[PDB]
Design a protein around this ligand. Structure first.
Ligand SMILES: CCCCCCCCCCCCCCCCCC(=O)OC[C@@H](COP(=O)([O-])OCC[N+](C)(C)C)OC(=O)CCCCCCCCCCCCCCCCC
Ligand SMILES: CCCCCCCCCCCCCCCCCC(=O)OC[C@@H](COP(=O)([O-])OCC[N+](C)(C)C)OC(=O)CCCCCCCCCCCCCCCCC
Ligand SMILES: CCCCCCCCCCCCCCCCCC(=O)OC[C@@H](COP(=O)([O-])OCC[N+](C)(C)C)OC(=O)CCCCCCCCCCCCCCCCC
Ligand SMILES: CCCCCCCCCCCCCCCCCC(=O)OC[C@@H](COP(=O)([O-])OCC[N+](C)(C)C)OC(=O)CCCCCCCCCCCCCCCCC
Ligand SMILES: CCCCCCCCCCCCCCCCCC(=O)OC[C@@H](COP(=O)([O-])OCC[N+](C)(C)C)OC(=O)CCCCCCCCCCCCCCCCC
Ligand SMILES: CCCCCCCCCCCCCCCCCC(=O)OC[C@@H](COP(=O)([O-])OCC[N+](C)(C)C)OC(=O)CCCCCCCCCCCCCCCCC
Ligand SMILES: N[C@@H](CCC(=O)N[C@@H](CS[C@H]1C([N+](=O)[O-])=C[C@@H]([N+](=O)[O-])C=C1[N+](=O)[O-])C(=O)NCC(=O)O)C(=O)O
Ligand SMILES: N[C@@H](CCC(=O)N[C@@H](CS[C@H]1C([N+](=O)[O-])=C[C@@H]([N+](=O)[O-])C=C1[N+](=O)[O-])C(=O)NCC(=O)O)C(=O)O
Ligand SMILES: N[C@@H](CCC(=O)N[C@@H](CS[C@H]1C([N+](=O)[O-])=C[C@@H]([N+](=O)[O-])C=C1[N+](=O)[O-])C(=O)NCC(=O)O)C(=O)O
Ligand SMILES: CCCCCCCCCCCCCCCC(=O)O
Ligand SMILES: CCCCCCCCCCCCCCCC(=O)O
Ligand SMILES: CCCCCCCCCCCCCCCC(=O)O
Ligand SMILES: CCCCCCCCCCCCCCCC(=O)O
Ligand SMILES: CCCCCCCCCCCCCCCC(=O)O
Ligand SMILES: CCCCCCCCCCCCCCCC(=O)O
Lengths: 123, 123, 123
């Protein structure tokens, strides 16, 4: 429960996230058309891989999530970090393609990656 | 069972799908060589992400799939939609890179995404 | 256990793998800068998809992994194949982008893909 509770919710978000944004980018791509080209391309793949390792990591301490400890918060903020980070980006075809923005997204993937990873594993 | 039954099968397909097609594209890429360049590149990533969110969504109502309701059919046709959709595409390096074809694939990802997602979640 | 044991470990590796390598490439990309451009781009996506289907396949005989038979070894060497394969590659922006190296990585994905896939499925 506590467990299912966690994963679905994060992912659902995550997947409302990645979902609007995917078809959406598709939809805008053709609609914009071009700068928006990479913009859209761009959203997909950073995010697609935000998710891609989200998926690795979440999905797994998922079904290996024994300890009672509260860790979902990061499942939760890493989402929270990464969304506003893309969203912050968020149209500049010029590099920078990054910023404090992703010092948030990636780097939280990193922190919440790092701890929780190690956590349900070594236990 | 009913459950395992579902996921493996869809994925197996899905993964026979994504699998021939991956090494295959590799194999053809070098063999064609060039137009086939993006063609192959092309197959991977639409499909790679067909799968990528397949994976998100399937995999999860997977292990959160309680209701008796018949929903696998779409696991099943969204595959059925997406394969023939790429396959329909399926060599034009000119945009369009889409069509009624993906009005099928993506959009079923969308429908079968949308309902089943919400379904085992809100329950 | 035996099961959890398996998946986490492979993935952890896999995910220490894909993880250093992702932020890392990011980090080097900006730092190199350019040839390193595709190099880094390059690492991500072969590997990102090494993982991408790893994820499909591992993750699933994962929770459908009944037989006692020893199959983790490949979870294990396919990792072992693929790492040293990228790593072998591993800076040439000239094609070849492949070699005996990936005759290892991909092709083990293939062998260990192929058998274990079929195995916990048909059972
Ligand atoms: C609950 C907390 C108690 C107190 C709350 C009070 C907090 C109030 C914060 C007030 C802030 C004051 C504003 C100064 C900021 C100026 C920033 C700036 O100049 O831009 C930098 C710019 C710099 O831009 P740039 O010029 O480098 O590039 C832009 C791109 N070009 C140039 C191509 C156009 O960086 C960004 O754009 C980042 C975007 C920030 C987006 C912020 C929106 C998200 C905020 C989330 C939190 C909000 C509440 C959610 C709560 C939900 C509740 C559960
Ligand atoms: C943008 C900036 C960068 C962002 C990148 C990523 C984010 C980086 C995160 C960094 C780590 C932050 C550290 C916080 C934790 C440190 C505190 C600590 O250790 O104290 C002990 C811990 C543990 O609790 P305790 O140990 O004090 O309690 C003792 C009770 N016994 C021993 C009997 C069990 O305290 C907490 O952290 C509690 C925090 C709870 C969070 C607040 C919400 C609780 C309510 C739940 C529902 C609320 C709705 C929210 C839903 C959100 C919807 C979107
Ligand atoms: C069981 C049902 C009862 C009745 C079955 C009877 C159904 C019989 C349907 C007969 C159809 C009549 C044909 C008219 C169609 C003409 C289409 C056309 O012109 O092409 C559009 C074209 C338009 O092309 P275009 O010109 O825009 O671009 C092509 C690309 N260039 C130009 C670069 C070369 O679009 C497509 O290519 C789509 C490809 C369609 C592929 C169809 C094969 C898959 C069909 C799956 C179902 C088959 C059975 C599976 C059953 C399994 C059983 C469990
Ligand atoms: C290319 C075009 C776009 C494609 C994109 C994606 C596809 C879009 C899908 C859109 C939705 C379609 C709606 C269909 C459902 C609506 C019907 C409905 O609501 O009625 C009630 C529902 C529910 O059943 P019921 O409620 O009528 O039964 C009552 C019994 N009690 C109450 C006691 C439990 O009926 C059905 O849908 C039954 C359909 C079953 C499907 C037919 C096959 C059954 C046999 C199984 C094995 C067959 C082998 C197949 C293997 C395939 C291999 C590849
Ligand atoms: C335990 C076993 C018992 C015996 C152990 C004894 C084994 C000892 C093997 C000794 C080998 C002798 C060396 C001859 C090889 C020459 C290769 C060559 O020329 O390069 C080809 C080259 C050809 O290069 P190229 O010229 O086509 O392209 C390079 C790119 N450019 C040109 C752009 C610069 O291919 C490679 O680079 C492949 C890289 C190989 C990397 C090997 C390191 C990994 C080895 C893993 C095993 C090690 C132990 C791990 C054990 C862990 C324990 C649990
Ligand atoms: C770079 C080159 C390409 C690489 C690409 C991918 C790799 C390709 C792999 C190809 C397949 C290789 C075939 C090997 C198996 C064939 C042998 C066989 O069938 O015999 C019967 C099998 C089965 O056992 P058995 O059937 O003989 O035992 C009988 C006992 N009863 C019947 C009662 C149950 O034997 C084995 O394979 C045992 C091998 C075990 C592996 C050795 C290690 C065991 C110790 C565990 C801990 C060690 C630490 C290691 C951790 C690693 C850390 C990173
Ligand atoms: N889908 C591609 C995305 C590659 C990409 O956008 N690369 C960015 C940096 S990654 C960027 C980022 N960062 O650099 O901080 C971090 C990040 N993350 O942490 O997730 C996401 C990034 N992004 O822009 O997508 C870049 O500078 N490309 C060179 C160019 O445009 O010429 C991949 O997987 O490799
Ligand atoms: N792997 C890349 C694929 C990007 C791509 O092929 N973009 C297509 C549209 S996506 C296309 C699609 N569509 O547009 O309808 C929908 C789709 N889907 O629903 O899955 C898949 C698409 N595709 O061609 O792969 C395009 O028009 N690119 C600009 C160009 O070639 O210059 C990514 O993840 O962003
Ligand atoms: N992320 C891209 C990666 C595409 C890519 O690097 N393509 C390589 C071949 S794939 C290569 C490979 N191989 O060809 O043997 C196999 C492999 N694998 O088995 O995983 C990985 C490869 N790689 O270089 O990433 C290529 O030759 N591109 C054309 C060009 O650079 O102009 C995708 O998913 O399509
Ligand atoms: C329960 C899991 C939620 C699944 C949503 C999948 C959306 C995919 C985003 C790409
Ligand atoms: C919900 C996530 C929204 C992501 C918006 C990303 C903005 C793109 C910036 C490039
Ligand atoms: C049981 C799951 C089936 C796994 C097949 C994986 C194939 C990967 C396709 C890329
Ligand atoms: C099994 C799926 C086959 C996919 C074929 C895709 C055709 C590519 C069109 C571009
Ligand atoms: C237990 C599973 C291990 C999760 C590590 C995820 C790292 C992601 C790599 C991209
Ligand atoms: C741990 C995996 C390390 C991968 C190194 C890949 C080298 C890139 C070659 C291109």
């Amino acid at each position: 429960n506590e467990v299912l509770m966690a994963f679905t919710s994060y992912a659902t978000i995550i997947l409302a996230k990645m979902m609007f944004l995917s078809s959406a980018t598709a939809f805008q791509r053709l609609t914009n058309k071009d700068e928006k080209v990479e913009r859209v391309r761009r959203a997909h793949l950073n995010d697609l891989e935000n998710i891609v390792p989200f998926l690795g990591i979440g999905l797994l301490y998922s079904l290996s999530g024994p300890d009672l400890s509260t860790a979902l918060i990061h499942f939760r903020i890493f989402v929270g970090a990464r969304i506003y980070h893309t969203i912050a980006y968020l149209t500049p075809l010029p590099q920078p393609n990054r910023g404090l923005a992703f010092f948030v997204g990636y780097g939280v993937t990193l922190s919440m990656a790092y701890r929780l990873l190690r956590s349900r594993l070594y236990l």
